[PDB]
Chains A and B, each alone.
With several copies, the nearest count.
Chain A
Amino acid sequence: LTPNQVNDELNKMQAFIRKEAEEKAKEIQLKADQEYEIEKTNIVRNETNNID
């Protein structure tokens, strides 16, 4: 259309897209770390139970 509006929007939509990608990133790290914690604390309890 006109250079200014395209210049703004072309980059801005993808800027929000990557903001959403950052939100996805934070979500994946958070959930994966929580799964890590719970699986560790669940396996260790049973290991020690059997050991003792």
Chain B
Amino acid sequence: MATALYTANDFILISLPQNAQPVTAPGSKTDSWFNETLIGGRAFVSDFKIPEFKIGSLDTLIVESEELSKVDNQIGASIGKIIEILQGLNETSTNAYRTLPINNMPVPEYLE
């Protein structure tokens, strides 16, 4: 889901294998049959670009997952502290430069 509160949107990722199906009506597969299923015919549903990463053990899998999760959430808190100190700088009375074209580029796509 999301965490911020602005004139912006929210985003999620999900695991969907090939054997899986978007079961709401029979006779279809993954990519199709899910275009406006999410109410409104307004959203835009895409995939994520990432290849394999060479791995030796599942016991490895678990350890890298744990340490990552740790640092991930730690830096999430770090970026929260950042936005805090940026507001302290108060470039604008309200929050500034957030939701503005990210890296000078319109925000919506700049993650997709």
Contact = CB atoms under 8 A, between A and B. Distances in A.
Consider the complex of A and B and state whether they touch directly, i.e. have CB atoms less than 8 Å apart. yes
B57 A20 contact: yes
Contacts of A23: 56
Interface residues of B, number: 6
Interface residues of A, number: 6
Interface in A14-52: 16, 19-20, 23
Contacts of A10: none
A22 to B, nearest CB: 10
Nearest to B57: A16
B19 interface: yes
A11 interface: no
B55 interface: yes
12 contacts: A4-B19, A13-B58, A16-B55, A16-B56, A16-B57, A16-B58, A19-B54, A19-B55, A19-B56, A20-B56, A20-B57, A23-B56
